[PDB]
Each structure stands twice: as structure tokens, then as C-alpha cells.
Amino acid sequence: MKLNVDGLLVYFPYDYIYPEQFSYMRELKRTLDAKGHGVLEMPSGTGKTVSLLALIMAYQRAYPLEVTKLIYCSRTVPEIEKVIEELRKLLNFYEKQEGEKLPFLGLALSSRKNLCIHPEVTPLRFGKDVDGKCHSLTASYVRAQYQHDTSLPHCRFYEEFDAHGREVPLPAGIYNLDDLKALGRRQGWCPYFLARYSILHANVVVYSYHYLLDPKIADLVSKELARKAVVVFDEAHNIDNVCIDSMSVNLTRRTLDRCQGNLETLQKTVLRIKETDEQRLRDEYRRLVEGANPVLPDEVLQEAVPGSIRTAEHFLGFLRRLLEYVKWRLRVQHVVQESPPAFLSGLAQRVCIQRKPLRFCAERLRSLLHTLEITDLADFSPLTLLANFATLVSTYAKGFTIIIEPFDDRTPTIANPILHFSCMDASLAIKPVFERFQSVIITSGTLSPLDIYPKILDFHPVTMATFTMTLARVCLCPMIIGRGNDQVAISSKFETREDIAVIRNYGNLLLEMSAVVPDGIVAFFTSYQYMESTVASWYEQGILENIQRNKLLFIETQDGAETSVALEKYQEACENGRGAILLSVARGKVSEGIDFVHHYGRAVIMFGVPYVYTQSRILKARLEYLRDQFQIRENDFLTFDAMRHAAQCVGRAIRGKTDYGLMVFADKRFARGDKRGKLPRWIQEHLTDANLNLTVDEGVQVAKYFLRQMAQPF
Amino acid sequence: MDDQGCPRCKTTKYRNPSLKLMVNVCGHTLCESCVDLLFVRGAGNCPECGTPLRKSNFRVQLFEDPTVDKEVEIRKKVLKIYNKREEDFPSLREYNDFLEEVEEIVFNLTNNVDLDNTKKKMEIYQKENKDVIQKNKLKLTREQEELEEALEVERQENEQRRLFIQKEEQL
Ligand code: SF4
Ligand SMILES: [Zn+2]
Ligand SMILES: [Zn+2]
């Protein structure tokens, strides 16, 4: 299937493409031709990946100099595996068409914990542990000692990789993570480091955001080599939250105590090093005078001189002083306090800690800790986190804020206070990506309206188009139910949350919808506490028992183990005729991680508009700062955060292969024009005024009829 | 307040944390209920060490770590010296070399004998006070004044923003 696109001719593996695919390809080609960053939305969970990859490959063939390589990022490794599968299929199709191999390379990066071949680190699954063990095995000290070949466990894979892969790079091919593990085992090399080196000469590289956003690890692999590369973020509508998380650092009392203990161990190790080997490790002082990774981005990062901290004892005392200041500032009991610049000024005044020497604290920590030949960085990780916070605060506070919480939420009195350093704008941390890369395409599904995104992230978009899925059959028939059998408002307001009548309306709607809907249904609440209250009310009444009789019921919990077990049983229930009703939370990690396909989550129920609690002070900074700068109304941003989350958690049923399914929102709030307007275009256009505010019974009847229509073949 | 207790009367440190450390030439975790016990007999003598004190050598401080208490007080005293701004020296190394010597002096004073430090500090007193020390006292006073002025300007702007949006709504 060769498509005569306006720009050029583009190959395509599958037989047919919908008109929305034509629109997507033409708009994407327009953006690439303009060579300017832009954002676009496409409904389908699958199909967008293949269309995007095919268009990018064709554009690379036409103008190889224009685009050096493609950097395609996905939320999670299980998801990016499907992307690499799609890319492998496309490459096989193109190779068959051409009749011969071409110099094209495509690979996926992942954590050493996810992929590795060392038996010692294999049993351990905790990421910091894998990082520390690998650092110990690959340490420059361990490398030098391996040169001596003394009796000590040395990781042969990295040494063999240094010997061979340095000389010879991999010719070409596509390697999934699992297949790359096998390749590393066969060749006695690192599946991780081999891909890391291939990044220098790779046409396509795929990895999650935390490999491309956080300055600590993103920069090293996203160096200026890709000066003009097509960087693409997929389903990255929750990009602001992750970009903020890449900067926010949380300091707790337990973490601070662990830091103090680690610092004591550091002092003891320094004394032992002084008595054992002093001159050779002191040469570090000379190289320092000449002049865990830094959290400072490219331009913000500075390397002039370490500062007043030039020796191990001096640096240790500096950390002692700063840790004492943080300890006392956290121990203070008072209302939540915000102080972005005042915190730095008060630190400098109270404990005599100048911001310039504080700036290089984390970098000097890395160097000095390397000198100590520590067993691993896992033990001292809390100290490195505190150092990253210490350097960040002295680095900048213009678009940041230090929040102190002597008392935690959900606890009238708790002896574990927490100090947050949550950011307020993601533009600060995502600026390097936009500036360095010629164009970035934020391709997303279920995207809340694009107009806000340029305001939140400071960039000038080239194209702003919303693509609506078009099929010969109406795959999706969304509806909103606001009126119950009692013709009573069913809004899940904070003041209306306690309403037993509203809870009863929700329970009856779920009962009837489970009675009619086929096997497999997922209901998303607004919070764990609200979900528990509704479940308890239904349990006190007889509605819950009737729901249990009609279909099996499963519930989500904060604990990941129970969540995984419940979802595993839910899948089997969906396969069998019992069916299942999975209650979950919109913010729950399960909602974002899981993907619902044919005969999975057939009818997506949304109980109440997803709104975060109006007491969490972090969102207060994040929101009022957005009001002050970029001029976004607080209510506007709050409703945007609700609609984007709802679209995220309700857009799964249309994953791909044209699998029918209905999305019912049991809240009259969605019927409001603002919510409908902010809803994604593809869902909204299907939505109509006739079914906008159906009663519970009318919604059930129309759902039954729509399921009848979708049951029959094409 | 996290300290287990005074070397002698570790009681108050358990009942209430209101007591704050008292700095002395000895460098000690002294506590007010124990300061009264020192005043009654000796009147300015460390109980165990017996170090003489002119006038009780007592000043309030707030950190559970006695080492941090001594280090912070010594740094407070030292900052009065070597306060010249960085830009006064064009040499790249000299920017932080003198700070290295300053912190070395602080660590020296914390534990080792301070006689050499005092003699050196006399030498720096004579040579630098002639011109530079008083000049940088003036400049640091100017920057303290202007930082307090700038914070009051920030808070005037925030009060005006609050009250003007309130008057927008009511108008
Ligand atoms: S050096 Fe390679 S094989 Fe050895 S632990 Fe690290 S990633 Fe695994
Ligand atoms: Zn006492
Ligand atoms: Zn004493």
C-alpha cells in the first residue's frame, strides 16, 4: 500500500487507511516541512503509531539531512514494547518491498533493572539496587582492579563490550528489549550499554519520558548529537505532571534521619580511607582545584569551580550544616509555609550557607562519593536526594516553591512531616527539549483541548488540528446520565457527596448497566475515600448484593500487589461468562497503566467528574502560579485537569481493531457545555444532544439497543 | 531538641524541648536548668571541664547537634573577617581559595588550638582593616538593607494584587 502523499510517496503495511489517517499524515508532513514544534491529537490507541512511523521513515528517506533520527517516547515499557512490535512489522514490510536490507537501525532503551544478564543482579528487582550493583561492578576502581585481574567478582560483560563493541557497532536491525537481552547473552555484551552506544548511530530510538526529561539521566543520552531530530511523545497528555515530577523532590523526617546515619557512615569511611590510602585519593583535590547525576539542565548547569567545599571534611561539614537546617525547618510545627527565595535567603542568613557554594553541592557529592570507593550508592541514596534538593534550591526558585507540611493529610497527628519542593510550571524543565530539538511532536490520545498546552508549556505550535475517527460503523456511542429514576441531580459535588439519594442512583444505574452490559465492565470513581464510602453505602443497602449476583465485583486498593492480583482475576472473569465489574480510581496507577481492548472494559462507567481534593497545598502553588503567569483561570485549569483525566480514563475502550464499546458518564456535570467543549473532539462529535442527559432507564435502554446494533457483523 | 539529654541533668530534654543550647568558650550542650546550677556555684565555670568564663559566656542557640552549634557560632565570628566580596579579586582561583582558608580556619578553631588562628587573625586584622575590611562591612550592610527593601516591595506588590482583584470582583 503506497500512498501518494502530497509531500511524497509513503509506504504503508496495512491494506486500507481511514480519512482521519490521511488528515493525520498531511498535517504531520506540514509540521515536518515547517520544521517547527507542534502538537496534534489522534483518537485511536493503535494505528497512530504505524501511521506516524511510516510517515517519519518516508520523510527520512526523502530528506535524510533534514531529520537525523526519530526519538519516539511512550509512557511505559509494556506500552513501548507494542510500539517496537509495530516498527518491526513496518520494517519487515518495507524490506520485502525493497527486496534488500537498508542502513536502518531501530532500538528501545530500558533500565538495567528491566534488562540485564548478570546473575547477581537478576534476583533483585529494586531499581536503585540494580543501579548501585551495576555501578559497583563497572566502577573505575573495579575496572582498574580487573586490569590487575585479582581474585574478585568482576562483571565480564561490560569489559567484553568495551573490548569489542567499541571497535564494531551493530550493522542494523530491530531489537525488542527481550530480544536484545538474548543478543547480549549470546555476544557476551550489555543489552543496555550496546543500545546506549547505538544511540550514536541509530535511526530510531524509543524510551520513556524519564529517559528524556529529568536532567540527571536524560541529558547524557540526549546530548547535542541529535541537534535536528524528530522527537515525538506519544499519549503524552499527562506530560506536565511527569515533567513536574522530574523536578519535585520530597524530603521527609525518616529520609532525613537515614541521611544523617549515612553521613555518619561517610565520616567513618573517610577516616578509614585517610588511615589506609590518602595520597592517591587526595589527587582528587588537585583535579577539583583544576575544575546520581546533576539535576541542572544544559544551560543552567555550571562547572566553574566546586566552591568553598574543596576537601572531604569541608564538604561533610557543609552537608551537616544544611541537614541540620532542613531538620529544624521541618520540625517546626505551623501552618503550611511556602518560600521559594525566602528559604534560600533564610538558610544563608541562619546557617551561613552561601548559595554559590550550595549550587555545586550535588556535583561535588558525586565526585567525593566516587573517591570513597563505596560499596554501592543504594545505601546513600537518601543523601544524594537531599543533595539534589540542596543544589536545585540554590540553582533557581523563580518558577519553583518550597512547601513545608508539619502535618500530613489523612492523619490528625503524625510524627512524619514532609517537605515538598513541587514545581509550578513544566515549561522550565521541558525548555531544553524544545530548544535543542528542531521540532517536537506531542502526539496524544484523549487530549483535552490543545489551546491550553501552549500556555502551560512555552512553545509556538505550528499546527493545531483535532482528528476525529471515522469508520463505516459507529464503534463508540458515549452518553452522559445526569438524571436518575427520581429525576434528581446526580452531580458528585463535595457538598453533594454525602447524598444517600445520589449514591443510590449510582448504585441502581450500575446494577441495571451490569444486568444489560456483556462481560467486562470498569467503573472509575474520583477518590479512594469516595469509592469506599459509596461501596459501604451499597453494602448496607441490598443493591451491592444484587450486583454481586448479576456479575462478579472486584475493587482496587492502594497496594500494587492486591491491584495486580485483582486485575489478573478480572481478566479471567472477562474471558469467562461470569463477567466482572472493576471499581477503580481515576488517579490510580492502574487506570493509566492498564489498556482496555475488545471484550475488556466493554462499557466504561465514570462515577463523578474526576477532581483532586481542594486541600492539597501543592496544587495551590501549581494553580495560583499558573493564574499569575500564563493567565489561566483557576476554574479553567481545574476543569481542564478533570476533563483531561476523564478522557484518559475513558478513552481506552476504543484501543483498536474497531471493537465496539460505550462510555457512560454518570454525572450531570459532563452535560455542561464547558465540559463538553473541553472533551476531546472525536468523543464530543459522536455525542449528541438527544442522548446528552438521558435518565438512568433511558440510558440503559439505549445502551442495550446500541449493543444489539454492534453485535451483528459489518 | 533531639538530643537524649544534658550530660548531667538529662530530664528537661525529655519532659519538654523548650530549653535551647547555650554557647560558651568551651563549646557545650548547656541547658538553662543547668545554667542556674552553674550560676549558683562558680558563676561561669564549666562543671566537668572547669573552663573559666568572664560573664557566664552564655548566648542562646537552636540546633540539636552540639558540633553544629559550635561550628555555626565560630563561623558567625569568622564571617566578620574575610568578608571581602568575590569580585574584588579578578583571579579565578582566588575567588574560592580564600574561602577554603576561611573554612580551614573554622575547622581549626573547632577542635585544634586557636592560638595560631588568633595570631593569624591579628595579622589579617592589621593589613586588611587599613582599607578593605571596613569597606566590605559597608557594602554588606548596603546589600542587607536593599534585600530587606526588596522583600518589602514584593509584599507590597502581593497585597496590591490581592486587594485589586477583590475590588475587581466587588466593582
Ligand atoms: S555491567 Fe552490564 S551485565 Fe554487568 S550489571 Fe551492569 S548492565 Fe548488567
Ligand atoms: Zn538539664
Ligand atoms: Zn566543658
Swiss-Prot record, chain A:
Catalytic activity, reaction form: Couples ATP hydrolysis with the unwinding of duplex DNA at the replication fork by translocating in the 5'-3' direction. This creates two antiparallel DNA single strands (ssDNA). The leading ssDNA polymer is the template for DNA polymerase III holoenzyme which synthesizes a continuous strand; ATP + H2O = ADP + phosphate + H(+)
Effect on the protein of changing G661W: No longer interacts with GTF2H2/p44, has 5'-3' helicase activity
Disease per UniProt entry: Xeroderma pigmentosum complementation group D: An autosomal recessive pigmentary skin disorder characterized by solar hypersensitivity of the skin, high predisposition for developing cancers on areas exposed to sunlight and, in some cases, neurological abnormalities. The skin develops marked freckling and other pigmentation abnormalities. Some XP-D patients present features of Cockayne syndrome, including cachectic dwarfism, pigmentary retinopathy, ataxia, decreased nerve conduction velocities.
Phenotypic consequence of R602P: In XP-D and TTD1
Biological-process GO terms, alphabetical: apoptotic process; bone mineralization; central nervous system myelin formation; chromosome segregation; determination of adult lifespan; embryonic cleavage; embryonic organ development; erythrocyte maturation
Control of this protein's activity: Interaction with GTF2H2 (p44) results in stimulation of the 5'-3' helicase activity of this subunit. DNA unwinding by this subunit in TFIIH is stimulated 4-fold by XPA and 20-fold by ERCC5/XPG.
Gene: ERCC2
Motif DEAH box positions after renumbering to this chain: 234-237
S-S bridge residues: none
Keywords: 4Fe-4S, ATP-binding, Cataract, Chromosome partition, Cockayne syndrome, Cytoplasm, Cytoskeleton, Deafness, Disease variant, DNA damage, DNA repair, DNA-binding, Dwarfism, Helicase, Host-virus interaction, Hydrolase, Ichthyosis, Iron, Iron-sulfur, Isomerase, Magnesium, Metal-binding, Nucleotide-binding, Nucleus, Transcription, Transcription regulation, Ubl conjugation, Xeroderma pigmentosum
Keyword DNA-binding listed: yes
Motif (Nuclear localization signal): 668-681
Binding site for [4Fe-4S] cluster: C116, C134, C155, C190
Cofactor: Mg(2+); [4Fe-4S] cluster
Recorded family membership: Belongs to the helicase family. RAD3/XPD subfamily.
Keyword match Thylakoid: no
Effect in UniProt of substituting R644H: In TTD1 and XP-D; able to open damaged DNA and incise damaged DNA
Co-factor: note: Binds 1 [4Fe-4S] cluster.
Residue ranges of domain Helicase ATP-binding in the record: 7-283
PANTHER family, A to Z: DNA REPAIR DEAD HELICASE RAD3/XP-D SUBFAMILY MEMBER, GENERAL TRANSCRIPTION AND DNA REPAIR FACTOR IIH HELICASE SUBUNIT XPD
Lineage of the species this protein comes from: Eukaryota, Metazoa, Chordata, Craniata, Vertebrata
Protein's cellular compartments: Nucleus; Cytoplasm, Cytoskeleton, Spindle
MF annotations from Gene Ontology: 4 iron, 4 sulfur cluster binding; 5'-3' DNA helicase activity; ATP binding; ATP hydrolysis activity; damaged DNA binding; DNA helicase activity; metal ion binding; protein-macromolecule adaptor activity
Positions of ATP binding: M42, P43, S44, G45, T46, G47, K48, T49
The protein's name: General transcription and DNA repair factor IIH helicase subunit XPD
EC number: 5.6.2.3
Organism this protein belongs to: Homo sapiens (Human)
Curated annotation (Swiss-Prot), chain B:
Annotated positions of the Phosphothreonine modification: T51
Subcellular location: Nucleus
Zinc finger extent (RING-type): 6-50
Main subcellular localisation: nucleus
GO cellular component assignments: CAK-ERCC2 complex; cyclin-dependent protein kinase holoenzyme complex; nucleoplasm; transcription factor TFIIH core complex; transcription factor TFIIH holo complex; transcription factor TFIIK complex
Keywords of the record: Acetylation, Cell cycle, Metal-binding, Nucleus, Phosphoprotein, Transcription, Transcription regulation, Zinc, Zinc-finger
Tissue: Highest levels in colon and testis. Moderate levels are present thymus, prostate, ovary, and small intestine. The lowest levels are found in spleen and leukocytes.
GO biological-process terms attached to the record: adult heart development; DNA repair; G1/S transition of mitotic cell cycle; negative regulation of apoptotic process; nucleotide-excision repair; positive regulation of smooth muscle cell proliferation; regulation of G1/S transition of mitotic cell cycle; regulation of transcription by RNA polymerase II
Modified residues (N-acetylmethionine): M1
Molecular function terms from GO: cyclin-dependent protein serine/threonine kinase activator activity; zinc ion binding
Residue ranges of every copy of the UIM domain listed in the record: 142-161
Assembly description: Associates primarily with CDK7 and cyclin H to form the CAK complex. CAK can further associate with the core-TFIIH to form the TFIIH basal transcription factor.
Function recorded in the entry: Stabilizes the cyclin H-CDK7 complex to form a functional CDK-activating kinase (CAK) enzymatic complex. CAK activates the cyclin-associated kinases CDK1, CDK2, CDK4 and CDK6 by threonine phosphorylation. CAK complexed to the core-TFIIH basal transcription factor activates RNA polymerase II by serine phosphorylation of the repetitive C-terminal domain (CTD) of its large subunit (POLR2A), allowing its escape from the promoter and elongation of the transcripts. Involved in cell cycle control and in RNA transcription by RNA polymerase II.
Name of the molecule in the record: CDK-activating kinase assembly factor MAT1
Species per Swiss-Prot/TrEMBL record: Homo sapiens (Human)
Lineage, broadest ranks: Eukaryota, Metazoa, Chordata, Craniata, Vertebrata
Gene from which this protein is expressed: MNAT1
Residues represented out of the complete protein: 1 to 171 of 309
